PDB file of C-alpha atoms in Angstrom:
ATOM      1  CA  UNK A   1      -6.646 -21.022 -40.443  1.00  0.00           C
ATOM      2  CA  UNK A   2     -10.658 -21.628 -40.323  1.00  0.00           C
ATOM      3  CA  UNK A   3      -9.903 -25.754 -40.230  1.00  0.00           C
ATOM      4  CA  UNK A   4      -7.520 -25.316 -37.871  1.00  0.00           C
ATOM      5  CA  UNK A   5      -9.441 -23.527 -35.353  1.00  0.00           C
ATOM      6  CA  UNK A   6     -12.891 -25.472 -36.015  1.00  0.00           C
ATOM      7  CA  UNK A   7     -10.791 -28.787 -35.726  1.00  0.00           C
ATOM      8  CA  UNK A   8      -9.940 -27.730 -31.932  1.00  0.00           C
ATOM      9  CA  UNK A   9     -13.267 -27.195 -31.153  1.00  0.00           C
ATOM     10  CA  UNK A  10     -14.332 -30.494 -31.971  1.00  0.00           C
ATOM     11  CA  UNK A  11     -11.467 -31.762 -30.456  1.00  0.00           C
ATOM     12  CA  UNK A  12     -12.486 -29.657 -26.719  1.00  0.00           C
ATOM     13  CA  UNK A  13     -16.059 -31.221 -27.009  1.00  0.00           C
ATOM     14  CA  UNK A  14     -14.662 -34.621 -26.867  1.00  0.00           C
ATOM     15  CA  UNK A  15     -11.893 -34.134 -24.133  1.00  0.00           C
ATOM     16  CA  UNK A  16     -15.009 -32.888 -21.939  1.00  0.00           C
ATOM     17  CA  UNK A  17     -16.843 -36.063 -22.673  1.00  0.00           C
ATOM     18  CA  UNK A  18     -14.346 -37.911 -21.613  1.00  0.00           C
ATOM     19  CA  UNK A  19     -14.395 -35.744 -18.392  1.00  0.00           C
ATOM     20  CA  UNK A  20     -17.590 -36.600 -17.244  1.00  0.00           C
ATOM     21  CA  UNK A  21     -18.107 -40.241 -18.270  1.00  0.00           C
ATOM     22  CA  UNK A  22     -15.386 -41.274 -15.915  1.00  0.00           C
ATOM     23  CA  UNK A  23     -16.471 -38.812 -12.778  1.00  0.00           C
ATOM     24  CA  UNK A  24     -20.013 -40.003 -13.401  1.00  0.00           C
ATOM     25  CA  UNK A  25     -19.417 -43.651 -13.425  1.00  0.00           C
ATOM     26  CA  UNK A  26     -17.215 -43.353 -10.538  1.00  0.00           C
ATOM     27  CA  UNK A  27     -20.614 -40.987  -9.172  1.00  0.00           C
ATOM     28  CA  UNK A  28     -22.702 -44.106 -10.268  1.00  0.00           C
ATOM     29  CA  UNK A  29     -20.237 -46.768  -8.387  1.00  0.00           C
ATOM     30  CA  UNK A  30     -21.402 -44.931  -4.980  1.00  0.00           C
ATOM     31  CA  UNK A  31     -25.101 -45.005  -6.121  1.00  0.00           C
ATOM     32  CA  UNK A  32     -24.821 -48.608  -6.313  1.00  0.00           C
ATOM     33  CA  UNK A  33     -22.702 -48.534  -2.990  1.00  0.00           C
ATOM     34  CA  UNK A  34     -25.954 -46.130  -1.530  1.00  0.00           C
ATOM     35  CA  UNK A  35     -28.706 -47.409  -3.189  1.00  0.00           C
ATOM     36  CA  UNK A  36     -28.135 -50.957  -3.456  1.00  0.00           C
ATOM     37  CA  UNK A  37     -30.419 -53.497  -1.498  1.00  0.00           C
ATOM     38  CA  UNK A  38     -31.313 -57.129  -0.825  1.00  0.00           C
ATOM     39  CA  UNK A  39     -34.277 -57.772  -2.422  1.00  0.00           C
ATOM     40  CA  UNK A  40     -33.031 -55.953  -6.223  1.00  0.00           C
ATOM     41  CA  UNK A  41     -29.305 -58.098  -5.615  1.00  0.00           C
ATOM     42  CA  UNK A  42     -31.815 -61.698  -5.550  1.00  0.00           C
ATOM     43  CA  UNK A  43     -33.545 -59.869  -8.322  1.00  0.00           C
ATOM     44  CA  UNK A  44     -30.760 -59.552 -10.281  1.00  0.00           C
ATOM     45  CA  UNK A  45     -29.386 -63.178  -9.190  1.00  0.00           C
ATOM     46  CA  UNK A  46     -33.263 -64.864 -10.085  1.00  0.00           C
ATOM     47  CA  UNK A  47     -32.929 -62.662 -13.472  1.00  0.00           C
ATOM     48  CA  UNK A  48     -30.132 -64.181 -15.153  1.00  0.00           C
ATOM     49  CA  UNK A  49     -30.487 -67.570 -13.583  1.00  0.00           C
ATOM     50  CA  UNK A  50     -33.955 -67.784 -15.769  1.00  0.00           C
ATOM     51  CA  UNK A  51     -32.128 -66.643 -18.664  1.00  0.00           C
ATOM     52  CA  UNK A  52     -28.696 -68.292 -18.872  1.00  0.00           C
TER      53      UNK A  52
ATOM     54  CA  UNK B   1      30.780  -3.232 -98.049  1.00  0.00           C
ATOM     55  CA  UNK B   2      29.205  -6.860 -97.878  1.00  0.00           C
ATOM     56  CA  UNK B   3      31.456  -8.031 -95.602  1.00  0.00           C
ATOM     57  CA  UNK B   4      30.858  -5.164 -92.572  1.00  0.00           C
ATOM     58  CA  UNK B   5      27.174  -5.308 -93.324  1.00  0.00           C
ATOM     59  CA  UNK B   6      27.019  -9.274 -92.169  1.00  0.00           C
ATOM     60  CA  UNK B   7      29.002  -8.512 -88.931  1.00  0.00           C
ATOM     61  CA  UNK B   8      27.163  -5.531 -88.004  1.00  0.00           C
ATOM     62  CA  UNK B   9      23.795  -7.595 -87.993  1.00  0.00           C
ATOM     63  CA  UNK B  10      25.225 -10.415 -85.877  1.00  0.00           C
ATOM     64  CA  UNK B  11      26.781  -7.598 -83.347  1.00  0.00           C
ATOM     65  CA  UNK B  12      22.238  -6.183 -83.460  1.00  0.00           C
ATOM     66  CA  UNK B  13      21.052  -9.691 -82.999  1.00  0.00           C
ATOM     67  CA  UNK B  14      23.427 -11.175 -79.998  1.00  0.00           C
ATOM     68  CA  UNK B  15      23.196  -7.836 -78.514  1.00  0.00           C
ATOM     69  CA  UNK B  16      19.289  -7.504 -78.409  1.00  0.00           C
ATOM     70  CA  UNK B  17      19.391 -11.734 -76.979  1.00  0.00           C
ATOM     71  CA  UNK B  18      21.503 -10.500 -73.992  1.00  0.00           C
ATOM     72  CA  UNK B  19      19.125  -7.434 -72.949  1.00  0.00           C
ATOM     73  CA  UNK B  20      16.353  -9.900 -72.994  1.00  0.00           C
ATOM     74  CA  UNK B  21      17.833 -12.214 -70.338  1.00  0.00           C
ATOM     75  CA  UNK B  22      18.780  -9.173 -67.836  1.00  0.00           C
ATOM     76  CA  UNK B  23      15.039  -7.858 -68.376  1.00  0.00           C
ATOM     77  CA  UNK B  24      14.068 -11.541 -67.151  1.00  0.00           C
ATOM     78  CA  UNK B  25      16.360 -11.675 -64.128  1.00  0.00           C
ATOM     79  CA  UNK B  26      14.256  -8.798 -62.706  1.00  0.00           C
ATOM     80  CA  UNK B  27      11.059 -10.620 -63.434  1.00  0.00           C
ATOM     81  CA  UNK B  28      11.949 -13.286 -61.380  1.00  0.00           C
ATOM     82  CA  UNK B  29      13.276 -11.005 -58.211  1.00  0.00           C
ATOM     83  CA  UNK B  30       9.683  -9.269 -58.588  1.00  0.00           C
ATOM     84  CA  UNK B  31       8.277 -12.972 -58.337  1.00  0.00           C
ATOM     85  CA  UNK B  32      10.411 -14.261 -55.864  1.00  0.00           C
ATOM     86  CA  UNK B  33       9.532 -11.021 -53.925  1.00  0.00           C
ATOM     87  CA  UNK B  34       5.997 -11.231 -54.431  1.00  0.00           C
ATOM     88  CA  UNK B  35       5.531 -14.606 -53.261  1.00  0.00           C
ATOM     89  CA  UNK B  36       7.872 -14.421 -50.170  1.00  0.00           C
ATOM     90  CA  UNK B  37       5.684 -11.368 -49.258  1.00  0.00           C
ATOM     91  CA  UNK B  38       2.568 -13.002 -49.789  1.00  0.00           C
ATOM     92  CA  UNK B  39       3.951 -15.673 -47.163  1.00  0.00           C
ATOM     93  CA  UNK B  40       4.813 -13.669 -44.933  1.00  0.00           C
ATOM     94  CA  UNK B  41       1.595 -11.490 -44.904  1.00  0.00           C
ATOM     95  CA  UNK B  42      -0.211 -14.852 -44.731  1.00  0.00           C
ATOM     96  CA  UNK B  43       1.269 -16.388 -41.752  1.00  0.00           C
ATOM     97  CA  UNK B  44       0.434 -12.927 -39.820  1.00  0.00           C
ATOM     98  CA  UNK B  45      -2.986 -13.352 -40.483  1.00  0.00           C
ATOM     99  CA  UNK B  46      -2.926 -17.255 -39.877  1.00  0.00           C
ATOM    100  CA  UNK B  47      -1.867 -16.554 -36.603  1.00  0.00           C
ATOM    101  CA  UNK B  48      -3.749 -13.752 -35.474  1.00  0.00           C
ATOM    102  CA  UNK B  49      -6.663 -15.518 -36.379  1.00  0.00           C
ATOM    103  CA  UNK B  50      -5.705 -18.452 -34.050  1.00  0.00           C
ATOM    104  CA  UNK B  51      -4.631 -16.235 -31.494  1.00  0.00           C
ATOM    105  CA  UNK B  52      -7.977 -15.068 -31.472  1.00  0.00           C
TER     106      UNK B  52
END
């Protein structure tokens, strides 16, 4: 009866991580979308094009 | 004389072997009892518990 219940509570904390990692990526998809710019997309592009 | 005295010790002996299976049967309906009960008071708790 104890390993029963303590086995759903780990089981609740790792349902509710996996409800936040997808609503905050899909939070971090409209950062890019709002925060995105220019000068940081050549910086990525001049990053990995001295490093390939 | 001889002859009676034989028979009425076999008649003692087979007599006192039957009494100790009936006395045996009962043991086992107190067991079988006992346990069922202690099932049955267990799963009560069990799931109160998880109720809880």
């Amino acid at each position: 009866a104890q390993a029963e219940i303590e086995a759903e509570r780990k089981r609740a904390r790792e349902e509710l991580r996996k409800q936040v990692a997808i609503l905050a990526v899909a939070g971090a998809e409209k950062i890019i979308e709002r925060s995105v710019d220019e000068a940081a997309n050549s910086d990525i592009v001049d990053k990995l094009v001295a490093e390939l | 004389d001889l002859d009676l005295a034989k028979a009425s010790a076999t008649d003692q002996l087979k007599k006192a072997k039957a009494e100790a299976q009936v006395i045996i049967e009962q043991a086992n309906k107190r067991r079988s009892q006992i346990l069922d009960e202690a099932k049955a008071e267990a799963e009560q708790e069990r799931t109160k518990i998880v109720a809880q």
